[PDB]
């Protein structure tokens, strides 16, 4: 998926 | 499931202080956010679990260091030349996203205590005692750090009661008061007990409060 | 000033809410994800949401559909809103955007949900210093307000007539059990200051209504 800190 | 943090830290100005977060690792980069007492959150960099690639904040660009060990799955934050500002409590953080929703997972939190300070215990003193109330209390004052909890009774007593939130004092100790409000029909007979309990230098007191 | 938020917002239950997210001018809250997290005291902040627009919008797994997201081009602010207001979701509010290659925080919004409480005048108790605190040479006036609403008050000290503050340390109004306010103030002196000194007065104000209670040696 994404990173969610990034 | 979850992130799981290493324990409370108290340091003096200058030393370093080194605390771990703890997968129940990820793919994905595990950030730390601190929260200074009564403030905002504050990012201060993420590391990436794969590479160990780290991306500090601009402002610890310098006296923070950011690791992991893949092998026990822990997260390590670093943090050198401690100021008294840095007195927070500092969360690790991850998570992932999808189009639909997000995911983010925190740690229970590290509370870091920086000051010049020694760790001492409290002096606790009773606060002696309408439509038939009286207000008794204790003073739990002098202590540091910070966590001490306020019970009436070893906890039997809930109703009526309020412990309040610590002061910092210009001294740098703190000090709370925690209250109860009786009938006074009752103060010669019932016996009220406060149970003060400071874990950081493992200090329990047991006050009563008795009418002069 | 990257973000700002209000202070403070206070509402009734089953109304909605909308919390502001000013950018700064210049940062155009059409190009930036503003994150949505909730905070209730004594545990980590938890994420709501994050929104962009309304072709661009993640939830948060298992956040109710009465948080959403919004944002105004003119006011250059993104907006969360709070549809339900439960008393459950009395917390703190922060945003957040990834700008200038780092994670920027807002201050912060305390919303306040208010669970019908009628206008309640302070309770204030000024306890003199204990005999055993007197014992080990030291003296703390405790001056205690209980059972106000709403949890506004403005506490004052005075050694005689002189109005005091130093030595003084006053606890923000926080909530009891039964949903009223109650605030502590305590003014530290020595126990020769103490007996120096004829009477010490802390003085409470509440609703435009003043109430002072008095401790002699």
Redesign the interface.
């Known amino acids: 998926?994404?990173?969610?800190?990034? | 499931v979850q992130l799981v943090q290493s324990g409370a830290e108290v340091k003096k100005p200058g030393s370093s202080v080194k605390v771990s977060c703890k997968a129940s690792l990820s793919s994905?980069?595990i950030?730390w956010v601190r929260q200074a007492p009564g403030q905002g959150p504050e990012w201060m960099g993420?590391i990436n679990p794969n590479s160990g690639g780290t991306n500090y904040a601009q402002k610890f660009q310098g006296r923070v260091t950011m690791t992991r060990d893949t092998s026990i799955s822990t997260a390590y934050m670093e943090l050198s030349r401690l100021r008294p500002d840095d007195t927070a409590v500092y969360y690790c953080?991850?998570?992932?996203?999808?189009s639909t929703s997000?995911?983010?997972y925190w740690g229970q939190g590290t509370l870091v205590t920086v000051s010049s300070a020694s760790t001492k215990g409290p002096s606790v003193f009773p606060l002696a005692p309408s439509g038939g109330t009286a207000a008794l209390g204790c003073l739990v004052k002098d202590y540091f750090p910070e966590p001490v909890t306020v019970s009436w009774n070893s906890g039997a007593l809930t109703s009526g009661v309020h412990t309040f939130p610590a002061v910092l004092q210009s001294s740098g100790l703190y000090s709370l008061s925690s209250v109860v409000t009786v009938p006074s029909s009752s103060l010669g007979t019932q016996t009220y007990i406060c149970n003060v309990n400071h874990k950081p230098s493992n200090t329990k007191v047991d006050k009563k409060v008795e009418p002069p | 000033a990257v973000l700002t938020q209000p202070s403070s917002l206070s509402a009734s239950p089953g109304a909605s809410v909308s919390l502001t997210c000013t950018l700064r001018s210049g940062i155009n809250v059409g190009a930036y994800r503003i994150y949505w997290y909730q905070q209730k005291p004594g545990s980590p902040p938890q994420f709501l949401l994050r929104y962009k627009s309304d072709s661009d919008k993640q939830q948060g797994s298992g956040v109710p559909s009465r948080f959403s997201g919004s944002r105004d081009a003119s006011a250059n602010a993104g907006i969360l809103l709070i549809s339900g207001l439960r008393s459950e979701d009395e917390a703190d509010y922060y945003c957040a955007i990834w700008h200038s290659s780092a994670?920027v925080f807002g201050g912060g919004t305390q919303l306040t949900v208010l669970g019908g409480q009628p206008k309640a005048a302070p309770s204030v108790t000024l306890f003199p210093p204990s005999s055993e605190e007197l014992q080990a040479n030291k003296a703390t006036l405790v001056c205690l307000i209980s059972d106000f609403y709403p949890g506004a008050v403005t506490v004052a000290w005075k050694a005689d007539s002189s109005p005091v503050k130093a030595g003084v340390e006053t606890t923000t109004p926080s909530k009891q059990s039964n949903n009223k306010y109650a605030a502590s103030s305590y003014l530290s002196l020595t126990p020769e200051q103490w007996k120096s000194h004829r009477s010490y007065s802390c003085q409470v104000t509440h609703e435009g209504s003043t109430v002072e209670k008095t401790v002699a040696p």
């Open positions: 998926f994404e990173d969610f800190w990034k | 994905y980069a950030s993420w953080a991850s998570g992932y996203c999808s997000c995911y983010d | 994670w």
